[PDB]
Ligand binder design. Structure first.
Ligand SMILES: COC[C@@H]1O[C@H](O[C@@H]2C3=C(C(C)C)CC[C@]3(C)/C=C3\[C@@H](CC[C@]3(O)COC)[C@@H](C)[C@H]2O)[C@H](O)[C@H]2O[C@H]3O[C@@]12O[C@]3(C)CCOC=O
Ligand SMILES: COC[C@@H]1O[C@H](O[C@@H]2C3=C(C(C)C)CC[C@]3(C)/C=C3\[C@@H](CC[C@]3(O)COC)[C@@H](C)[C@H]2O)[C@H](O)[C@H]2O[C@H]3O[C@@]12O[C@]3(C)CCOC=O
Ligand SMILES: [Cl-]
Lengths: 5, 234, 232, 5
């Protein structure tokens, strides 16, 4: 669920 | 026109059409069918995007299917569970294949030929990312190896980034973002995660006044993503 | 334990959640092409309809984008780019053609012939119009004339049955009214006819529980269309 | 384009 790039 | 150029043009067309399997094929054609030159900045970017989109559709399918399997296990509906599991295998098969595509290219060409430290950090992040996505669904020894393989690629990439790239560099900032998520999500370590993000963040903050207009958009954006993960975690 | 019909239906709901629409088509084809005389349940036909809609809808989106790009490159003078786009547009067009063929084939062979009530009659008929409409959007020459004609025929046929047979509130009657009015607008190129058909069907259900949500939604799409149309 | 359902 976490934000990554 | 040239062989390498219109394949690139085709990959941009496929991006617009949201047809990411085709986008990957075009960038593949570009990638190994060079020789021993590096990919250009714009080619790198187009590659990582093409793979991220193909993989993410499957990540999203896997989560939703994996969540329904669990709810159907509580209801005691044992036959649904058998059907769902079998579907889940189909999606897992695709995931292993996708990861294998990129991880093959990275080990065989891309990591061995990066000359600037920018690029070494870029491809070592990619490698970290794809192992991380194997660790999302593999189990047992397969998991343990994906998690180990991940830690070392991020560790390597970290050891170079902190010493050669600006604290505000978007690729440095990106490593720290995913690296922190790896700890949070894979290794169940909220505090390592919080502290790794926070440090990367503060280190960027103290160097802000010297941040190029060239990297401004991407850096400020990865800085917000580090803040949002922090806020949700905290 | 669930039958084969029950099972393929279930596999289809998973594919829908997972957003894997090609697979959702295949499972829904299986349910259909294992029958004989039986017509599909309301649930099943709604699923086939959703399955195909999303599969085509992704090609139509891709198509519009690629169209906009060659046209922008036609006037930039960019000759080699135009050709590559052209060849790519064709590849998107083969898929489009093959998809429409899937559902037209099954509609002409099975679904249309065994529709007993005025419910099912209007449905597969709407469906036939819909998929000839998608053909019309991209075909040229003779192929274009043919499809737009098949579009009118099917849409007009279903119209009679709708007016004589179904409440003007009913979801199906209203959907048809919407899609029909869009056909007149985008392909038949006549604003006023699109506006008359759309203006009236809104007005009629302005007169008349299970249907509330669906109807009010398609009623809202009508207004949303009339207002946009009127303003341009 | 225009709304259909
Ligand atoms: C996506 O490929 C195109 C390109 O990547 C570059 O951006 C890199 C990048 C992204 C940024 C929006 C943060 C996300 C994907 C990409 C290619 C990946 C990475 C970031 C940093 C971390 C990394 O991930 C490296 O991973 C191996 C860098 C290379 C960005 O500069 C460009 O500078 C952006 O400018 C526009 O074009 C780029 O993205 C955009 C279209 C602009 C973003 O839209 C609004 O800001
Ligand atoms: C599961 O298949 C879709 C299903 O369609 C049924 O409704 C038909 C329908 C639509 C309405 C939401 C407007 C759009 C898809 C569908 C299946 C199609 C059509 C409509 C109107 C005409 C038609 O288009 C058929 O074309 C032949 C009818 C059949 C709806 O009852 C259900 O009543 C809807 O209620 C829920 O389930 C439906 O959508 C939802 C889950 C309810 C929530 O609505 C969304 O916000
Ligand atoms: Cl996953």
């Amino acid at each position: 669920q976490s934000y990554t790039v | 026109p040239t062989a390498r150029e219109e394949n690139v043009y085709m990959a941009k067309l496929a991006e617009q059409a949201e047809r990411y399997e085709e986008m990957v094929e075009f960038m593949e054609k570009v990638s190994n069918s060079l020789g021993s030159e590096e990919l250009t900045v714009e080619e790198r970017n187009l590659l990582s995007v093409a793979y991220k989109n193909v993989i993410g559709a499957r990540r999203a399918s896997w989560r939703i299917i994996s969540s329904i399997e669990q709810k159907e296990e509580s209801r005691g509906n044992e036959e649904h569970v058998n059907s769902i599991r079998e579907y889940r295998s189909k999606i897992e098969n695709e995931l292993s294949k996708i990861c294998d595509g990129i991880l093959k290219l990275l080990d065989a060409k891309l990591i061995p030929s990066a000359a600037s430290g920018d690029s070494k950090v870029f491809y070592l992040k990619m490698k970290g990312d794809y192992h991380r996505y194997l660790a999302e669904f593999k189990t047992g020894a397969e998991r343990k190896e994906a998690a180990e393989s991940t830690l070392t690629a991020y560790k390597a990439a970290q050891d170079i980034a902190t010493t050669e790239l600006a604290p505000t560099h978007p690729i440095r900032l990106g490593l720290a973002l995913n690296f922190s998520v790896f700890y949070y999500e894979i290794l169940n370590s909220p505090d390592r995660a919080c502290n790794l993000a926070k440090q990367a963040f503060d280190e960027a903050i103290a160097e802000l006044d010297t941040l190029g207009e060239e990297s401004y958009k991407d850096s400020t954006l990865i800085m917000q993503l580090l803040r949002d993960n922090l806020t949700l975690w905290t």
